Amino acid sequence: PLVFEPVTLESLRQEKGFQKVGKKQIKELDTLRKKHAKERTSVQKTQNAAIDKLIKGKRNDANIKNSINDQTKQWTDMIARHRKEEWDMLRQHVQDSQDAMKALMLTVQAAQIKQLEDRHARDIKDLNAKQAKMSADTAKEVQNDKTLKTKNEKDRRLREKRQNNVKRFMEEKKQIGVKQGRAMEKLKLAHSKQIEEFSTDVQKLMDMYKI
């Protein structure tokens, strides 16, 4: 409900509306980490078979030592594979979500303007109460003031105060109008700064996962 809140990428992530997609993405990846884990035991178990086939005779044969060397680079090649497979998904994760967030950023800022506008118009409404009460209570003062002499006399002074009063409201109404136009402008640009920045923060993230 806050009128000048920075809409950063991290902030965009916390918005309730993105929780559903965020939750889905965390699983999709977790399952793969599980898939990685199975792929490792399966290869690990397969690796073992070779010893039964090869070391049944039992004197360290020259061929076996080379073979075990050959196996190790088959593990580290799958280890290093599983690395890039996760990161590749992480970078691809961002791209799909980024399209969604852009559409959500817009409705977060637009929310800020609608919150401000209804706040502006209410400040307007409050001033008229100040103005309307102000004008009427002054008249009450005319009756209250003893110095009045005649009804024709009472009216004349009221008209004069009625001009001094209106000099204020014209300025007060004009001065307020400027403050609102300025307040919206300084806001409405911050939006188009946070948005020109967002396009290039998403990019900065994808590169971090690039390999």
Numbering used by the authors: 865 to 922, 928 to 1080
Give me lines lifted from the publication on this model.
At the inner surface of fly photoreceptor rhabdomeric membranes, the master scaffold protein INAD (encoded by inaD for inactivation no after potential D and contains 5 PDZ domains arranged in tandem) forms stoichiometric multi-molecular complexes with phospholipase Cβ (NORPA), Ca2+-permeable transient receptor potential (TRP) channel and eye-specific protein kinase C (eye-PKC). Our biochemical and structural studies demonstrate that INADL PDZ89 forms a supramodule and binds to the entire C-terminal coiled-coil domain of PLCβ4 in a manner that is strikingly similar to that of the INAD–NORPA complex. The striking similarity between the PDZ scaffold and PLCβ interactions at the molecular level might point to an evolutionarily conserved molecular adaption in PLCβ signaling in the animal kingdom.
Confronted by this disappointing result, we decided to take a step back and tried to solve the NORPA CC-PBM structure alone first, hoping to be able to get some clues that might lead us to a way to obtain PDZ45–NORPA CC-PBM complex crystals (the structure of INAD PDZ45 was solved in our earlier study). Using lysine reductive-methylated protein, we were able to solve the structure of NORPA CC-PBM at the resolution of 3.0 Å. The packing surface of NORPA CC-PBM crystals involves an extensive surface composed of α1–α4. We noted that the solvent-exposed face of the α2 helix is lined with eight Lys residues, which are all evolutionarily conserved and required for the membrane binding of NORPA CC (and see below for more details).
